[PDB]
Design an enzyme around this catalytic site. Sequence first.
Site, PDB file in Angstrom:
ATOM      1  N   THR A 259       0.825  -1.196   0.000  1.00  0.00           N
ATOM      2  CA  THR A 259       0.000   0.000   0.000  1.00  0.00           C
ATOM      3  C   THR A 259       0.867   1.257   0.000  1.00  0.00           C
ATOM      4  OG1 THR A 259      -0.155  -0.039   2.416  1.00  0.00           O
ATOM      5  CG2 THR A 259      -1.871  -1.187   1.171  1.00  0.00           C
ATOM      6  N   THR A 260       0.266   2.362  -0.432  1.00  0.00           N
ATOM      7  CA  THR A 260       0.953   3.644  -0.517  1.00  0.00           C
ATOM      8  C   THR A 260       0.841   4.374   0.816  1.00  0.00           C
ATOM      9  OG1 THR A 260       0.551   3.826  -2.897  1.00  0.00           O
ATOM     10  CG2 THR A 260       1.053   5.856  -1.695  1.00  0.00           C
TER      11      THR A 260
END
Lengths: 241, 233, 240, 244, 242, 250, 218, 243
Positions: H30-31
């Site tokens: 995930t970012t």
Amino acid sequence: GYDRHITIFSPEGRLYQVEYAFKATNQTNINSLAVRGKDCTVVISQKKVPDKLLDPTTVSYIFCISRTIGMVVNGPIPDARNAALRAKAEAAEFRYKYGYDMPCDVLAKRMANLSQIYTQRAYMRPLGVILTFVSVDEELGPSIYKTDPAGYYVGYKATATGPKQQEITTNLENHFKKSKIDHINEESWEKVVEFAITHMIDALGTEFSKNDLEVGVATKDKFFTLSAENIEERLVAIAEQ
Amino acid sequence: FRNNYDGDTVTFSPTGRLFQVEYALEAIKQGSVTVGLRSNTHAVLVALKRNADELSSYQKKIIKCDEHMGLSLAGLAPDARVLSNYLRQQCNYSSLVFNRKLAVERAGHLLCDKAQKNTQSYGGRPYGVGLLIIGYDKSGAHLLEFQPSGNVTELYGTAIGARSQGAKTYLERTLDTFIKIDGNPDELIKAGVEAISQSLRDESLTVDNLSIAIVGKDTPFTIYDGEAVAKYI
Amino acid sequence: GYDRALSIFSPDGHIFQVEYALEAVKRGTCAVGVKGKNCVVLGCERRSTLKLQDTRITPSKVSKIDSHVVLSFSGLNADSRILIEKARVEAQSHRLTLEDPVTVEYLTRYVAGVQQRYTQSGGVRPFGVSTLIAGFDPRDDEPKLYQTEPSGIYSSWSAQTIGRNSKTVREFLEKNYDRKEPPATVEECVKLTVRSLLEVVQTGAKNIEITVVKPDSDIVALSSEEINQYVTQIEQEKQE
Amino acid sequence: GSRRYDSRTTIFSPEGRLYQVEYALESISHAGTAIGIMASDGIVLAAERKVTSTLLEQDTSTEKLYKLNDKIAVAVAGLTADAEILINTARIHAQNYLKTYNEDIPVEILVRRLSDIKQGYTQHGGLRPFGVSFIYAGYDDRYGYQLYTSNPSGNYTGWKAISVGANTSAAQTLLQMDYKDDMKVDDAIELALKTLSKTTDSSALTYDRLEFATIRKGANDGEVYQKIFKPQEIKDILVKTGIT
Amino acid sequence: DRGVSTFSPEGRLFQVEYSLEAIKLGSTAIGIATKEGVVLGVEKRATSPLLESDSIEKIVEIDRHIGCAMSGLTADARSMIEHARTAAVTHNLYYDEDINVESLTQSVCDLALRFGEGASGEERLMSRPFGVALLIAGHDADDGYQLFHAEPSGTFYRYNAKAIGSGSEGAQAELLNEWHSSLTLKEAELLVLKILKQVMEEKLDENNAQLSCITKQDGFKIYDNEKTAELIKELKEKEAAE
Amino acid sequence: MTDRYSFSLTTFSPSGKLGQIDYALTAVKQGVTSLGIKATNGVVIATEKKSSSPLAMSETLSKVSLLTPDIGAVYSGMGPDYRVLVDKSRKVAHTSYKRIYGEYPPTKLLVSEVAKIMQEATQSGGVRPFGVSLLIAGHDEFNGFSLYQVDPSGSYFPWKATAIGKGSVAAKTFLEKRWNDELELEDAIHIALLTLKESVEGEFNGDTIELAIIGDENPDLLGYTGIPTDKGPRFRKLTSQEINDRLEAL
Amino acid sequence: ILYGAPGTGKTLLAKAVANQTSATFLRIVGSELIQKYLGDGPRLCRQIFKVAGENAPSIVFIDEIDAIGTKRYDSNSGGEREIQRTMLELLNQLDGFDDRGDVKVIMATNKIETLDPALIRPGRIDRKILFENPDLSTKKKILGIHTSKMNLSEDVNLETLVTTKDDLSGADIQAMCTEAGLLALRERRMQVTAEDFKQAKERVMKNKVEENLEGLYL
Amino acid sequence: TGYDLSNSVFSPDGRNFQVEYAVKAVENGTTSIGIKCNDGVVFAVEKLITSKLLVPQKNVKIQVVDRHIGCVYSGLIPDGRHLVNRGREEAASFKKLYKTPIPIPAFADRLGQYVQAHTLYNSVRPFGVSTIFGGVDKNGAHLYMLEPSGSYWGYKGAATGKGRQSAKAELEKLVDHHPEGLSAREAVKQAAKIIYLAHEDNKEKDFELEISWCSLSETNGLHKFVKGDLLQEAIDFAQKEIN
């Protein structure tokens, strides 16, 4: 091949793992210069300028081991920071057991023999970074000890790191033959920074700004690194000559 | 894949995802299926008991850990025993030192750190057994889903084992049903029986293969079998 | 294949390393023994055909463990001497603790455990030498003959042979020896034992060594002329 | 067969004999030939040196013959790195018997225990077996003079006369023909120099390349005395025996 | 690396799977757990008449009321037998009570479910993987007569009638019919001999067949050769009439 | 497949001889040419130093170290391989001797202990033996002057004149060429300079050439006076300024 | 299936049966079955059964197969691609061939592990004969043939020559007696006597086998 | 080649492939972003919703160091928690001897030697996660991101994960918005908008916005979670801008 993954001797006597140690030092393409003055020693490292998302103050190629002692490292970063932690530990322990300052001659010897200890360990990988130790000795005075990732260290009149090291050595060799001395004039340590950067620009052939360089200064019983405002002040004095 | 990348747990892959963990998850797919769900005041787990043949008796997959907690073991048998005694030791260590029962969120962090040490170390076989852990603490009922990689995720309810999609489809449409039921432990167990029924392929429909365990703010964790679980069936 | 590893069970259910250890026994010296009613007899083959070898300073193949318990084997002697030393230390440790003389059943279970422990230990090579432990139980005249195999198991036998041509001598042990009525006299058990050895020895004297154990902790060693006396009596029936 | 595992001694060979022992016999044959002789009144030791270099000082160094104690003198043939480890260990263990029992260790007791030391590396552990050929020479009051050999398998065999190293079968055949049951000390010296002369490429049989040690019971008060003659004295016995 | 590398992994462990064939190479042992007792039996597997059947024994007594059997390599069994006897006297030490059959089986399987030298939260003893097929049967005051098969691979299961060895596959097919909840102690003795005689490679005899019974009153009792021969003649008399 | 390059660490060499020793002797052959001459009244050793960069200080590299004042040593091979060996070799001479007999280690005991470290490196797996070859020269009361050639395989032998490094085969004949055992120490130094000069013709001065001698004690290097019993150091390292004096008189 | 060496194991056993069966000896070289041309494999195999498929007064014999017995995985490493499809047609010709046993196919190679499991076809080949080391009674039968011609002394019988026998089956007993008759020519006599037997056997048993199989491993 | 089968081996490219594969494995996660302001730092993490069965305020990946440092990473979830749990003991070990909280540049040296040594060890598997930590120590606000290769530097902003390409362009715009940088409350609304812009590749699934920050103004040097009207204001502010 399996013969290229082993740390032990090769068929031709040329270790493939050691050839990759020097090859990884040029991966960052950083050109540093280490010279010896009379009473002082000034070392300048090339500071790569990233985008605005990185703090230039935190980014440094020079680590402070102790007072009067400094080290510049060119090569893989993960092995550069861990090598500085080993040099600091041996510096404080040597000033306790033996109760005396640890000279760069010994300080380059401890990390050199420590690299051979890593070669004796199968799980542990040796350091692939160059360790350049500079200081002002009480007796020998200015001294430069550059530890190769294979654990080779020897004193130098002038030394550098990079692809232009051959051009830097040749340019500084003819300059030392005219004055017949390996020390820079102008005993004042403020002016030593001027010449050390001047001879570097002529050797590299490219002028650098205040953010493109990091100037270390090792004086007697003191060590410090010039900030962005101090390096900019040096470039103004160098421009007038 | 044969050798090349992902041949060892330490060995990585060009993509960066170790496939040796997925191989340990394959044993959970055809292992004993279990279905569970929880409410604010209650938590329910329904596990299927397996057997070798007709003469082989069904073995309970739900193992007791804490008085207010429970878990179900679906996966490799020998790997599930060490993690069982590890959680039993942490519950007693928390009662001996902190005097408090082991928290669910704290049990998941210790269980994640336990299986992670053997993963990053060379050699050894990582734990491939799935664990669905429920418990009642000051924070309320919680249900953790332990993957063979060590990932911990909090959900209202989930299911693992053979044909786990049958119960997951039931839990998506009924998600708004069992969460609103409070103080009625019978309705939550009936929803678990209908959830596993859609998952099962109707191998053995008898009572002895289903083990229903429930815990709540009043009744602690208790494993029921025989005529106790035959009332809902 | 599977000879590189030990703990690997192989699809055949038998580790190839144990089978290769049996190949050294197939070329080993011939060790034959038979237990009677009142006595047990253990023969062995030590080749004297090697020139410039002093027999006085040459250690015997039969190793004394207890007073009423001896030890015979066939295989590499370098591996057996370790098994011999571990058995002798435990033999003294038996009286050091239980105060009783060495039990044939307890000694065999220990030697089997020595074969077991070093096999179950990683990086340790198992012993591929088969040893024969015989003797009488404490305060008992019943003969006890046990064996050891590289597979890590033990078994009891009335008559058993190991080494070169073990299958040929085994056929001699089944037909000409009756378990229901073992030989009562000492001379009959020794004379029939020599006939089994004369197959592999092929008319020789110093190549045969027989140590007979008697009740009440008595060990006797037949000399070269005494062993050759049984050979002459056997040759009388062949020339008849 | 096709796939042969040479790595660990714990790995059994398809034939049943470790191939590291086979190739260790080749390393012994590459070194010099050492011939021990067991006599009635003592033990005669003679050997030839592999180094032919003149710049090397042969008179001040002994490659094969060494002294474990006053009553035991051994000659090692094999790897030098493995020799100094086993010889020093043998000297430590031999003095340990003198510590506990206040006596000199017999030959059979020392030889049997040193044989299991080599086997300990093959029996357990991933360490290396030491291929070594010793010459066991000594005297005790039990069996008298005992002459034993050390094979790379870590065993010992009784020998009245034996040759190891290069020309093993060639020198042993010459000893069996001229062997004497009494084995006089003076005849044992002539028998050694006669066999070494045929097995050595040098026909003159130089004294500097030879190591000559003699045990004799005929010393004063009937005591065993080991004396290694200097190379100057080695040249003297070559003229008396008629070699030069 | 041969069998630990070349395989295409399905998510299985081939180390113990190779030992599964060695389990079928062991001695054939059949037993039935009833309410009036547990009748057990094994096969001596005598390849020569000089072998002593009374000297070697393939069954061990862990507790007075709890017996055991083995099929497989005896070397790997002796480590489990001594560990099973250690756990038996352990419960007789701290709690000074006869341990239950299911409680004892789980303690014995604690060693069979762990392998390797290094570990984290549990001690290790054996330095290499091993395995043995052990049939644990006995009687207690909790569940009564119980019979459990101890598998080094997975978790033990509860079997009323269990067959191990080479004839384990076909014998379980006969145990799905002849076995019944009303089988008495005398009927269980004759039922095993009828099944054991067929699955055994050799002829039925007192020397090559040794059976034992587990009850509450007599505890662990082994049938003598004379007592076994009497039950053999009863089987031949029943087969003669049919 | 081919050999795995074993020291006999975990595996014996099937060829009958260890193949990596010759590859370790290749690292010995990789070293500079270093020679020594054993005479009656003294022993002299000579070696050359690598120039590498022209700005490298020649006084930093020392290819002749000091173990005991009566015993010198010279090596050819990798730089860090000699430092780790001697740092351990010094502690062996101190504990096994100097902390027991409280004197200076003789020639027979000190050289034997140095080879024992190489023996442990070959026996203990995972640790590669260092590929440097050491020429140890010393003078004691028992054996007198001695010159030993320490091979990485763990074997040492005395030599009147011997050479190591790339010129190990070439200079060995060159030493025997101009020198004989009947010659003294004074005429031996001139022969050592002529033989070492043939190694490299670029610079013969004391900067790249490290020359050391063993001989009669020097009271200037003892550091104290007043005690006639304690002998002075028998090893005196020649200063590069004094080396040029022997070059003009060569 | 036969095992042994040419001249003893793969020769004497093949020719001895054709004598008692009164069948013509038919020899086909194993390498000739593969001509290195595509299609010659199935063609030459069918022609072998055609000559023996009329009156069947013969038996098929094939000896010394180092080639078609091993197809490997490919056309390299000793195998060939034409061998793969040739061994399959020989199976169809083996099952299609039906008689009372007047014609047999005898093939002898060093190793059967590289053979095609199809051509093996258990139940068609029930016979596997491995070379064994004969006992002392074998030498007495070979000596009796040559001693009927060459005269021997009265002090030397069949039990005297059989005393020393080291790893020789049937082939070199004739070769050893050849030197025994050659040494008598040096003494200028046509009848070997007791003095000749001792000196002749020593020149034979010695100086031949360099490798020593011995129990000195200890 | 066989350089990936043996850990801590020099590759012909200068860096181990396993170290390179660990860096590329971070992009699969995930970012997670971050903003370093003058009075403190702001952290924002993106969490992909697996299904409607997820309960909010449970799976939150925000990690804590002492009271003054927040922590967040991107990569394998079980591998990241073991690095944080060890860093929790490192901050406590410094607190035992020196009786004072650990500063940020000191917290990076302990975790630096911890990760960099494992990349040098064969028996220990290197980390495949990238950890972002920061806060306000006695020396002021500092931000450092620990890469899986072992290298770390001071960052005025942090970007990683799959949407790091779209997030890096927005972080560089912070100089264009204001020369002195946004305030503490303005950075929360700004960091949230970057999550929606980096969500264009993740638009096939839902998300839960999670933001945490520590400064000296409001929290007075304390690590707290964004809730109340501040969390809902940052959501509606970005939804109007993406129109």
